[PDB]
Amino acid sequence: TKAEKILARFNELPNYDLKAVCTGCFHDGFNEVDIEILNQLGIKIFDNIKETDKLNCIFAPKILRTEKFLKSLSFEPLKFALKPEFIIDLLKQIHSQININLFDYEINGINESIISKTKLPTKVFERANIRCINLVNDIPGGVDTIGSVLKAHGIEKINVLRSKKCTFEDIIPNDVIFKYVLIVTKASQVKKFTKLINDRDKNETILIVEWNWCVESIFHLNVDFTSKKNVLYQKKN
Amino acid sequence: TKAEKILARFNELPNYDLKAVCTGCFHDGFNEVDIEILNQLGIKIFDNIKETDKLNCIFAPKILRTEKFLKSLSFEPLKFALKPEFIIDLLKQIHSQININLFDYEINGINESIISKTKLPTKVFERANIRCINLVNDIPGGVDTIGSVLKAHGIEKINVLRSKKCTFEDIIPNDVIFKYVLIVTKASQVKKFTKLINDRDKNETILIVEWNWCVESIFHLNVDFTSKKNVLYQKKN
């Protein structure tokens, strides 16, 4: 009711139609009334991303590598990538007509072309034919967060390998082109993996990459197999 | 070995006597020869922190909030906080006498006074009488990494609270001053905890803080109970 009274001063309220999470901003959240005001203007802020909520918006000061920012590039679709200043200006204007627009707060780097790719009927790793991958347990950020980002972007199976207990038999193939795909952190995990695979499956193909290969692929919503950047080893026909 | 041949060119080798981890630098690591080179020079680089390794050194470009940086402030003791350029200049000098010193590469804000506090026979939260704390699981970084930092710094028991599945009975007291200590992320969570506790234990003391309160206490190796910075609520008698 207290938000309703504040908004009563207005002859007509915009419906911004945003379903958003915030990352790299609003770390302590919003007070009960601001949430109510925002809701009344068709803006719902969620704490976590649930595929259920059909999120369409991300608030962030810039392109970030957080789980949330990367995951927003798998929204279905992402419609708005907005700087926090949008909410700030909007709440400011409201707390004493409403004309804050959705166009003057775009995040540098996230443009029409990238955003529209979130409308594709496939995910980035899905159209790259990277379905089942191996991840070394010493991935910075832990394996659950990385795993969940990758699954959001179309990877079907995330197989965690522990360096350095893992054998060839723990490596899973990429059944959907590369038979083995691995994400590794230390450039000496490469040697061990290429030896194991070369010994047991000599003629098969292998792709070994750093987490930043995944990151850049998500940022572009495209796996560029042409790039050598963040590729630690590849064996193809 | 290859490392030995390279080092044979020197008529005397320093023993730097470092046992270190790196954070915010050398993300891919070192090749097999460099590791052996540094080793011959009394510099051991570890991947993760194990209390048994008795680390005495952190390599980092500046003061950081990573798990490794914060934990280096509980080494026993921390002897050197060094910029990665120390390793870079050392390796460069070696690959073509050895005179790179440990004094010209200190990290800013780190300090002989802070560094020497790591020799104390207590940990920072231990002398602050914060033994048992409650952590809300929506903390950015996950609880087990937050928990690991705090245990390293003398907190005996990290109790994880689920907002909003948690109840008064899930809250554990600080039995070693404040009977209840909570770390909370969302400002709107404070209301809920203080209501629960006030209803059930009206006369007892309560301290509720943001994660940055812990971080700064670690950075200073002191809990300043005089500070209102990052304190969300406190009830004292």
From Swiss-Prot, chains A, B:
Entry coiled-coil feature ranges: none
Ranges of residues in domain BRCT: 10-91, 109-217
Highest taxon listed in the record's lineage: Eukaryota
UniProt PTM comment: Phosphorylated by MEC1.
Cysteines engaged in disulfide bonds, as pairs: none
Compartmental location: Nucleus
Something else known: Present with 1380 molecules/cell in log phase SD medium.
Summary of the function given for this chain in its UniProt record: Required for resumption of chromosome replication after DNA damage, specifically in S phase. Is recruited to chromatin in the presence of RTT109 and RTT101 in response to stalled replication forks and acts as a scaffold during DNA repair.
Subunit structure: Forms a complex with the cullin-RING ligase (CRL) RTT101(MMS1-MMS22). Interacts with MMS22 and RTT101. Interacts with histone H2A; requires H2A to be phosphorylated (gamma-H2A). Interacts with RAD55.
Protein name as catalogued: Regulator of Ty1 transposition protein 107
Organism of origin: Saccharomyces cerevisiae (strain ATCC 204508 / S288c)
Gene: RTT107
